[PDB]
């Protein structure tokens, strides 16, 4: 019941700014205080700021990594928090978390980053001719992330979607296979679901024996 | 600046093992420490507050205990699903700060994977680039060895592996190797073949396709 939405992250140029929210419901927000962290990809949580209640003057501390660049403020009508991140280093680069000191949001990726957004292709990985296997390759996007689903939600077991490996191109790629009863392979459909929001793309692939 | 050190930073245990991870506070902090748990792809989650206060929904095999500079965080059975990393974190004075975390892994029976490979599609043979890929599937332990052949050529320096992380059910691991290639490279050799070396196999196991079929 209690939800933290993030928002507001994406792909920004060194030097530049943005402005994370935090979207807060299930609680008596005015009476929390709002927390930020982040964690590099493969690296470990790093507390960014807390700010405090009304009641406290909403006082404000900061990781000594941000403090200067980085402002964090709340809205108690709106029921929000916010990070606004100034003169953002490629160090910055990282998922970004809300916290009320008790739950946590989903996280929002910032990369700080002068590589341009590209879109990736959808490429089939069609079983051959009893367990049966198949999947889709996304591959030559930036920035991170993509999901993929199979059948619009509806297909879960046997699904592992690899994480991303950044290619020599300086362009990421991943995989997303599933395994499925050899019976079924002429008879039900898969589908896998591709979102590349950084570059506005979305694919539907049917993938089948060739 | 409070050091939060934890031990270990990797650890391998059983299911159903009691399972203990300490960390050591450079200054004392009275009971103002937390207990965070992140699965594989998820935010982190609240175990333990003060010291030893259980947050709500927390199962009960999750515990904590400790003050002043040592703390314990404990499960007391350890399932298949605690598969984690667990973080540690001071909060008495600001900057609150994470110990480096520990990674929990289970051990189990050896499995052996099973082996697909897949063709470029001729989709992307328009665009110039070949992907050809081999799957490893439900493997343990994760150690795997994977060779690429092209007409009996060992490819090398033109392959990317990526990994799963352990499976929240049968605790077994997933590969893929994609190997890519220019496609006029590709329309130049019949044989492509991935051979999988692995524990849970009793000799190297090769799976192949020829291009023209």
């Known amino acids: 019941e209690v939800q933290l939405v993030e928002s507001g992250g994406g792909l920004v140029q060194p030097g530049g700014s943005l402005k994370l929210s935090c979207a807060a419901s299930?609680?008596?927000?005015?009476?929390?205080?709002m927390n930020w962290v982040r964690q590099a990809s493969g690296k470990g949580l790093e507390w960014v700021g807390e700010?405090?209640?009304?009641?406290?003057?909403?006082?404000?501390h900061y990781a000594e990594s941000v403090k200067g660049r980085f402002t964090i403020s709340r809205d108690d009508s709106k029921n929000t928090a916010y990070l606004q991140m100034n003169s953002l280093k490629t160090e910055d680069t990282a998922v970004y978390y809300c916290?009320?000191?008790?739950?946590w949001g989903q996280g929002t990726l910032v990369t700080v980053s002068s590589a341009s957004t590209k879109g990736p292709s959808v490429f089939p990985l069609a079983p051959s001719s009893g367990t049966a296997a198949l999947g889709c390759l996304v591959k030559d996007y930036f920035p991170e992330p993509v999901t993929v689903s199979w059948n619009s939600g509806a297909l879960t077991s046997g699904v592992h979607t690899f994480p991303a490996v950044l290619q020599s191109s300086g362009l990421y790629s991943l995989s997303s296979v599933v395994t499925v009863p050899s019976s079924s392979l002429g008879t039900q459909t898969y589908i896998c679901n591709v979102n590349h929001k950084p570059s506005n793309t979305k694919v539907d692939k049917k993938v089948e024996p060739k | 600046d409070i050091q939060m050190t934890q031990s270990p930073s990797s650890l391998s245990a059983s299911v159903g093992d009691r399972v203990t991870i300490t960390c050591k506070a450079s200054?004392?902090?009275?009971?103002?420490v937390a207990w965070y748990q992140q699965k594989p792809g998820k935010a982190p989650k609240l175990l333990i507050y003060?010291?030893?206060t259980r947050h709500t929904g927390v199962p009960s095999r999750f515990s904590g205990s400790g003050s002043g500079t040592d703390f314990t965080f404990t499960i007391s059975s350890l399932q298949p699903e605690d598969i984690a990393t667990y973080y540690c974190?001071?909060?008495?004075?600001?900057?609150?700060?994470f110990g480096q975390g520990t990674k929990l892994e289970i051990k189990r029976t050896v499995a052996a994977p099973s082996v697909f490979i897949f063709p470029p599609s001729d989709e992307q043979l328009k665009s110039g680039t070949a992907s050809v890929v081999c799957l490893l599937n439900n493997f343990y332990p994760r150690e795997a060895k994977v060779q690429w052949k092209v007409d009996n050529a060992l490819q090398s320096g033109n392959s990317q592996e990526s990994v799963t992380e352990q499976d929240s059910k049968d605790s077994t691991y997933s590969l893929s190797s994609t190997l890519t290639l220019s496609k006029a490279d590709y329309e130049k050799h019949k044989v492509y073949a991935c051979e999988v070396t692995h524990q849970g196999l009793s000799s190297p196991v090769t799976k192949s396709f020829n291009r023209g079929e």
């Open positions: 974190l001071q909060y008495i004075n600001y900057p609150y700060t």
């Open positions: 200054q004392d902090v009275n009971t103002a």
């Open positions: 003060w010291a030893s």
């Open positions: 916290s009320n000191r008790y739950y």
């Open positions: 299930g609680f008596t927000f005015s009476n929390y205080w």
């Open positions: 700010i405090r209640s009304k009641s406290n003057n909403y006082a404000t």
